[PDB]
Design a protein around this ligand. Structure first.
Ligand SMILES: CC(=O)c1ccc(C)cc1N[C@H](C(N)=O)c1c(Cl)cccc1Cl
Lengths: 430, 556
């Protein structure tokens, strides 16, 4: 049904035309699924095929977000955003609650299906153009364009911002000590009450939502070993750490001392004022390796002294909203990985480790993907911004498989590290 | 014959106007050669004479081809295409024959004046204005204007294509399963019906199109069975590139060499084995197509090694989804690998090659994997599917690779295969330092400006050594120093370094690198029993480095 509701005229940053991104080749199964989805949406008036006059485009993908059964239609609006939303980052930006992080428990739930009913500016749909790729370039692409509000887009929830707040009041009222942030198709809700009491308050909001509109928060269902029920429950209470960790035992041989000092010299680049000379002096003798050499006096003063500087470190812990967040992950153990987020080199905002039960699915890629996603949400909460990921993998490899384990509505900007970092330690950071 | 099809809306680039080019007249027989066409084109409705209003001009040309009996004209919209908006990439991608389904009968129709039948936006017509003054330039009032798609205009391809796709829409409905592919001025229709039963539907289609203003000149079939599309030669059950002849000179240039490589690579699709490692390695020089590049001994043994295959014709099969897909990869050496994809044994579907160029020293495994990639990507692009991989590699060797390497990857279904060039890891550096092995603290450098360096070492057991070097880099030194440390060492050794650079290359566990030295080092690394390696700061670093570098510096 065509809704007579009025739209909001959308004008991006002049001197910057619409997106003309390249549609990655997809699996047959993937294209057909997308065809299904689209054909359905086409009926739902949501989208409409276009002609050649529309030269713009946008990537599309097939995900299995729900619980790996039905296909979700992911859309890479990473460009359109830059093109519009970055000027609608102020022109309609949603402020971030700097306490959300200080919270004790947070839950994320989809609310993308919300904008589907809302109409889109007439003089702008063109830019929403996306294409379903034909196998082996058989026929040209199947071209459509959103007549309503796009899910993947950032300018969508911005507009829905109004209608959202309004619907939120009733809950925000009866429940004041509950924070709510709206980043794209998702709503993050934070509470300080225990899980049980908290989980119930959720179904509440879930139900409340379904009450005030066809806004249907995708249902509950178990999955992993310790049986869950619903919602991605995050706990920013423990969102902190110092993954440094020095050898509490292995500090006897030359090598143990050798390799040690090297890391410490890299640490210089981060934590300032780290004395190792008194220590490095104990090896200057070109002595034989593996020789079990005990620690001296004046050298022992450089060990404990700088071992406490790593426990409590603060200096320039400033986050610049002007600058962008950069997160680079590095493969470590057979299951563990390490991420470091900063905006300026060595000025580490948040360092964290990741690891997926090495056994259920010891997939190299799967992990990375998962990690990327987790690292992302972590920032959203903490800064309400998506980092540019420096990914340690092959450009092509990724553009082939990320969409295989991608369980998010959003797609962060990424780069690929083709360089081996000697920064790989037992427990590495950046 | 115009088309009643809905013309798509066309406009100019933001705040831009149509071309205005009062072309210089030509009182030649050419001036009349035009009216012959225009006053028979306007008759056919293609164009129309417009009032002396605002319509701005565009260059006209009444030229005719060499001895062309039909004196046909041609107008070039070079400036117009500048003003007109951007359309959708008509033929962005290209369909590769290797991913087609074998059809019993096929026929190709000529859609020449196809563009001349499709109408043009009623509001864009005015931009196509053109004029033609006669003799004494006393009658310039011979201005026309296009109504259909102008030949050589910007939108003509995208639109037409678009229009056409919409024109076939209803036809492939009343009788689906009939494969119809359009390309520029071509229409490749293919169906699995007997010649007669097949030729039936064809005439249907023709009349169908005929009812849409578009006409098919050729009565039924005219295009001979062996088709030539983008070089590709097409046949009902096979495909190849019939014409693939590369001449032999004695002193060619870059201009000729690039083309040679071009043709060779083109042939890589089917002709299995075709290599270009050395054949291209020489183009590395400052591009100057008119500069003659002296053939090398290897370049000789390669071209000849290539011609060997190219001299004899080989074909490729088609796709049959019902059967599974498979591809096998094999190493050729010097960073050159070759792959073949097929469904039925020796029923080659397609082949190709991958090469790690411009870069140097890389693991054999990294490549095999990189290879898998190029293919995977290609498989999907063509069949939209991932093939079962048949590759020469032990699971164990591979496992330890991804477990040890830093960059993350993923190689789907793959099975082992046997072939002399068995890919493997010949060595592995000791994780933990060796207890009963000599230690070789090493150092090296060079007076960057003088180009003369010094490499050497010192051991736990005061076994020093130093060797001067000239005409080398600071890096070549750091490496040389290790080769030494290896040479004069025993079976199991521990080596310490000050170069992060030197450290890497080795850990990469590469092999067969064009770098002579690296090879001399690799071979050492293979012979050895155990080998540990560590790294420490270059300058302010001690552990011995505080005396090993003070020993290798003398001159500046
Ligand atoms: C995408 C496609 O079907 C296509 C693309 C380029 C060319 C030259 C012919 C094409 N199809 C034709 C056809 N009418 O089906 C074709 C096939 Cl399917 C197999 C072998 C020869 C031929 Cl001519």
């Amino acid at each position: 049904p065509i809704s007579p509701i009025e739209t909001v005229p959308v004008k991006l940053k002049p001197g910057m035309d619409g997106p003309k991104v390249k549609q990655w080749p997809l699996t047959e199964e993937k294209i057909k699924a997308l065809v299904e989805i689209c054909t359905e949406m086409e009926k739902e008036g949501k989208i409409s095929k276009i002609g050649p006059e529309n030269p713009y485009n946008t990537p599309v993908f097939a995900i299995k977000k729900k619980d790996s059964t039905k296909w979700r239609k992911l859309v890479d609006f990473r460009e359109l955003n830059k093109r519009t939303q970055d000027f609608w980052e102020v022109q309609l930006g949603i402020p971030h609650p700097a306490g959300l992080k200080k919270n004790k428990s947070v839950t994320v739930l989809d609310v993308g299906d919300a904008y589907f009913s809302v109409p889109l500016d007439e003089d702008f749909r063109k830019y929403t153009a996306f294409t379903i790729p034909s196998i082996n370039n058989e026929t040209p692409g199947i071209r459509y364009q959103y007549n309503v509000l796009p899910q993947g887009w950032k300018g969508s929830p911005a507009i829905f911002q109004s209608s959202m707040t309004k619907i939120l009041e009733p809950f925000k009222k009866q429940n004041p000590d509950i924070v709510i942030y709206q980043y794209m198709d998702d709503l993050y809700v934070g509470s300080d009450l225990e899980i049980g009491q908290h989980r119930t308050k959720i179904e509440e909001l879930r139900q409340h939502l379904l009450r005030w509109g066809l806004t249907t928060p995708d249902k509950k269902h178990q999955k992993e070993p310790p049986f869950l029920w619903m919602g991605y429950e995050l706990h920013p209470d423990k969102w902190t750490v110092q993954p440094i960790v020095l050898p509490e035992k292995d500090s006897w041989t030359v090598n143990d001392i050798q390799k040690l000092v090297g890391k410490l010299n890299w640490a210089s680049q981060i934590y300032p004022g780290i004395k190792v000379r008194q220590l490095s002096k104990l090896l200057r003798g070109t002595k034989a390796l593996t020789e079990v050499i005990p620690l001296t006096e004046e050298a022992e003063l450089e060990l404990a002294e700088n071992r406490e500087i790593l426990k409590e470190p603060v200096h320039g812990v400033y986050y610049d909203p002007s600058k962008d967040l950069i997160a680079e992950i590095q493969k470590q153990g057979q299951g563990q990985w390490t991420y470091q987020i900063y905006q300026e080199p060595f000025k580490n905002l948040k360092t964290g480790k990741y690891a997926r039960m090495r056994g259920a699915h010891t997939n190299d890629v799967k992990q990375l993907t998962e990690a990327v996603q987790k690292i992302t949400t972590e920032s959203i909460v903490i800064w309400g911004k998506t980092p540019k990921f420096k990914l340690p993998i092959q450009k092509e490899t990724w553009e082939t498989w990320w969409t295989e384990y991608w369980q998010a509505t959003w797609i962060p900007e990424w780069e690929f590290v083709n360089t081996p970092p000697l920064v790989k330690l037992w427990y590495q950071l950046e | 014959p115009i088309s009643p099809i809905e013309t798509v809306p066309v406009k100019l680039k933001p705040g831009m106007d149509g071309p205005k080019v009062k072309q210089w007249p030509l009182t030649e027989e050419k001036i009349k050669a035009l009216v012959e066409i225009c006053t028979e084109m306007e008759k056919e409705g293609k164009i129309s004479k417009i009032g002396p209003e605002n319509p701005y001009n565009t260059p006209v040309f009444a030229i005719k081809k060499k001895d062309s009996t039909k004196w046909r004209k041609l107008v070039d919209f070079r400036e117009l295409n500048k003003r007109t908006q951007d359309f959708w990439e008509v033929q962005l991608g290209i369909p590769h024959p290797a991913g087609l389904k074998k059809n019993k009968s096929v026929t190709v129709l000529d859609v020449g004046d196809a563009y001349f039948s499709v109408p043009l936006d009623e509001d864009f017509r005015k931009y196509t204005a053109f004029t033609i003054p006669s003799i004494n330039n006393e009658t310039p009032g011979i201005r026309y204007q296009y109504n259909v798609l102008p030949q050589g205009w910007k939108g003509s391809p995208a639109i037409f294509q678009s229009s056409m796709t919409k024109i076939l829409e209803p036809f492939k409905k009343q009788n689906p399963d009939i494969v119809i592919y359009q390309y520029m001025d071509d229409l490749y229709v293919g169906s699995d019906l007997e010649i007669g039963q097949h030729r039936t539907k064809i005439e249907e289609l023709r009349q169908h199109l005929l009812r849409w203003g578009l006409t098919t000149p050729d009565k039924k079939h005219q295009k001979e069975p062996p088709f030539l599309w983008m070089g590709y030669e097409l046949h009902p059950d096979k495909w190849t590139v019939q014409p693939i002849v590369l001449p032999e000179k004695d002193s060619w240039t870059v201009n000729d060499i690039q083309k040679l490589v071009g043709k060779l690579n083109w042939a890589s699709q089917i002709y299995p084995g075709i290599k270009v490692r050395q054949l291209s390695k020489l183009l590395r020089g400052t591009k100057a197509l008119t500069e003659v590049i002296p053939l090398t001994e290897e370049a000789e043994l390669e071209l000849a090694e290539n011609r060997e295959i190219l001299k004899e014709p080989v074909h490729g099969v088609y796709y049959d989804p019902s059967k599974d897909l498979i591809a096998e990869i094999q190493k050729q050496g010097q960073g050159q690998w070759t792959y073949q994809i097929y469904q039925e044994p020796f029923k080659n579907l397609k082949t190709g090659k991958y090469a790690r160029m411009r870069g140097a020293h890389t693991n054999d495994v990294k490549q095999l994997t990189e290879a898998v990639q190029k293919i995977t990507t290609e498989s999907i692009v063509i069949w939209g599917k991932t093939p079962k991989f048949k590759l020469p590699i032990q699971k164990e060797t591979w496992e330890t690779w991804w477990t040890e390497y830093w960059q993350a990857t993923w190689i789907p279904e793959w099975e082992f295969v046997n072939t002399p060039p068995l890919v493997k890891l010949w060595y592995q550096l000791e994780k933990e330092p060796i207890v009963g092995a000599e230690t070789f603290y090493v150092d090296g450098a060079a007076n960057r400006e003088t180009k003369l360096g010094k490499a050497g070492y010192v051991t736990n057991k005061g076994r020093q050594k130093v060797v001067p070097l000239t005409n080398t880099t600071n890096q070549k030194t750091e490496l040389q120093a290790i080769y030494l440390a290896l040479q004069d060492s025993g079976l199991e050794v521990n080596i310490v370094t000050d170069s992060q650079y030197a450290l890497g290359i080795i850990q990469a566990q590469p092999d067969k690198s064009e770098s002579e030295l690296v090879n001399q080092i690799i071979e050492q690394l293979i012979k050895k029993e155990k080998v540990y390696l560590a790294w420490v700061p270059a300058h302010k670093g001690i552990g011995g480095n505080e005396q090993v570098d003070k020993l290798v510096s003398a001159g500046i």
